[PDB]
Amino acid sequence: IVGGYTCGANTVPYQVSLNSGYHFCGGSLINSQWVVSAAHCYKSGIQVRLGEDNINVVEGNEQFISASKSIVHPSYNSNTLNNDIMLIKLKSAASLNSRVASISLPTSCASAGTQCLISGWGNTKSSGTSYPDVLKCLKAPILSDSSCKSAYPGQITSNMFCAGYLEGGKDSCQGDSGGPVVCSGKLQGIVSWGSGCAQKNKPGVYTKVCNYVSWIKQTIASN
């Protein structure tokens, strides 16, 4: 996250870190057994780390649980990033408590102008590289479809939205991928892509979670 703030330990209790020897992506706990992330975060050998604040120090509220199954969306295209969503099932159920909690799925799509919270352990510089150990947060609005399209001609599908600031300075970044965009208490986006980070006229692009709720629920119901 570029231009954000330190969230505070365990104040984003649905935020998980995906670890394969090191943190490589975020995700969102949606029930005791299942995490939402980006399909471009897929790999084998994932350990899900719940209850994290400093990802390099054991602080006392973590739960580490290995994935049993990853399901990439049926229509994910890794060239266009259309349908950039996957589900990860945990080998054992998480202990839910005030610091490890699931985030509700939307019941309708959110509108442009709605405020959201974007969070992760990604790069904090727009030029340059610096990775934080504690979780960072950014409050940012969803941008209109028309400004998103004009920012990225030929690249925004109906399964994507933009959020952030056309002026630049405040955005998600490499290492935030797969993490949450929560708006009015619902998971509306997944950190997906952009062109650099926090550049003028290049806002972040996010998977549009409201399009996937019936695939998410039916997948969970049979897996």
Ligand SMILES: NCc1csc2ccc(Br)cc12
């Ligand atoms: N918002 C931009 C963005 C999101 S994930 C990611 C990975 C690499 C880079 Br560079 C930018 C990004």
Ligand SMILES: [Ca+2]
């Ligand atoms: Ca920790």
Ligand SMILES: [Cl-]
């Ligand atoms: Cl792309």
